[PDB]
Amino acid sequence: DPTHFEKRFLKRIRDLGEGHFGKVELCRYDPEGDNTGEQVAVKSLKPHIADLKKEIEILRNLYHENIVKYKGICTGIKLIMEFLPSGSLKEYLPKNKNKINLKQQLKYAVQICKGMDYLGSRQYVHRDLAARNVLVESEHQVKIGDFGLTKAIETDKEYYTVKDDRDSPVFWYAPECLMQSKFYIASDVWSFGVTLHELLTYCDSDSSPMALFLKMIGPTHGQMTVTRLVNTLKEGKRLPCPPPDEVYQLMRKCWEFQPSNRTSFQNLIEGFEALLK
Numbered sequence: 535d536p537t538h539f540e541k542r543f544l545k546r547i548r549d550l551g552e553g554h555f556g557k558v559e560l561c562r563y564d565p566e567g568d569n570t571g572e573q574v575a576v577k578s579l580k581p582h583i584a585d586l587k588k589e590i591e592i593l594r595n596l597y598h599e600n601i602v603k604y605k606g607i608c609t610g611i612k613l614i615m616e617f618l619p620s621g622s623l624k625e626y627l628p629k630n631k632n633k634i635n636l637k638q639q640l641k642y643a644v645q646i647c648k649g650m651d652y653l654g655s656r657q658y659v660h661r662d663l664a665a666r667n668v669l670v671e672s673e674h675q676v677k678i679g680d681f682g683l684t685k686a687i688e689t690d691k692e693y694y695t696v697k698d699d700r701d702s703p704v705f706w707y708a709p710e711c712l713m714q715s716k717f718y719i720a721s722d723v724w725s726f727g728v729t730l731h732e733l734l735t736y737c738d739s740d741s742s743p744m745a746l747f748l749k750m751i752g753p754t755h756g757q758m759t760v761t762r763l764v765n766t767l768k769e770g771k772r773l774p775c776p777p778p779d780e781v782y783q784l785m786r787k788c789w790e791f792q793p794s795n796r797t798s799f800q801n802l803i804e805g806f807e808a809l810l811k
């Protein structure tokens with residue numbers, strides 16, 4: 535079985551990044567023991583097993599040019615994927631401003647929309663769409679690189695109701711996710727709009743969605759922060775345009791209060807393609 539990786543041949547090189555419960559490391563799968571084997575990205579849980587198994591099964595069945603490739607498993611379980619040395623958009627964009635212009639940013643935007651549209655056609659909701667979860671294949675190509683919070687939508691139903699909201703990226707969340715823990719495909723569209731703002735600002739820390747929303751609502755509300763966030767959104771207030779009128783209009787359509795007034799990923803692709811011709 536080419537999808538079964540033996541523990542004794544999986545050699546750790548360095549850490550790549552980590553979340554609260556999971557981590558990704560650069561390993562070499564070296565059965566010949568001479569450091570000639572291929573380099574792979576390995577996702578493991580820190581010393582949630584049920585959630586990782588579900589996550590592995592989802593990725594095993596996704597095949598798209600803008601989705602990170604599943605390679606296999608190491609059985610306790612570890613997820614084995616292809617290694618992208620340029621890393622996440624969050625770390626790549628600040629170091630490569632001179633290489634990446636607005637035209638390339640809009641191509642990245644189309645690519646994220648295509649990968650997301652494919653996911654949504656398989657009845658899944660991502661729930662964690664941000665620049666930190668987008669990998670750089672090359673200066674011409676990006677891939678959605680993580681599915682840690684991904685959930686299947688019930689048949690003859692349009693949303694998944696979340697029970698555990700403890701590690702939620704609240705500054706990327708739509709009003710319905712904040713008020714009722716209801717995740718629709720339209721909720722993923724809202725998060726894309728915030729990811730697009732990150733992309734246009736080159737993932738600058740001082741201009742991050744969290745930095746900007748805290749300046750809008752005040753940073754001393756503590757436990758009332760999410761309530762204040764809900765209030766500002768209810769008023770019609772949104773993240774400002776980075777220091778491109780037509781791109782900002784597609785972004786504002788991602789941020790329509792009611793999920794029904796929001797566009798679809800297919801509609802956004804048409805929008806970006808019209809601007810690239």
Ligand SMILES: Cn1cc(NC(=O)c2cnn3cccnc23)c(-c2cc(Cl)ccc2OC(F)F)n1
Pocket residue numbers: 550551552553556557558575602615616617618619620621622623625666667668669678679680
């Ligand atoms: C700083 N950082 C870098 C990361 N990853 C890579 O560099 C990487 C390269 N190839 N590869 C293949 C699959 C998954 N990750 C990678 C992460 C990272 C960490 C976690 Cl816990 C989950 C997803 C992550 O990656 C994100 F982008 F999807 N943080």
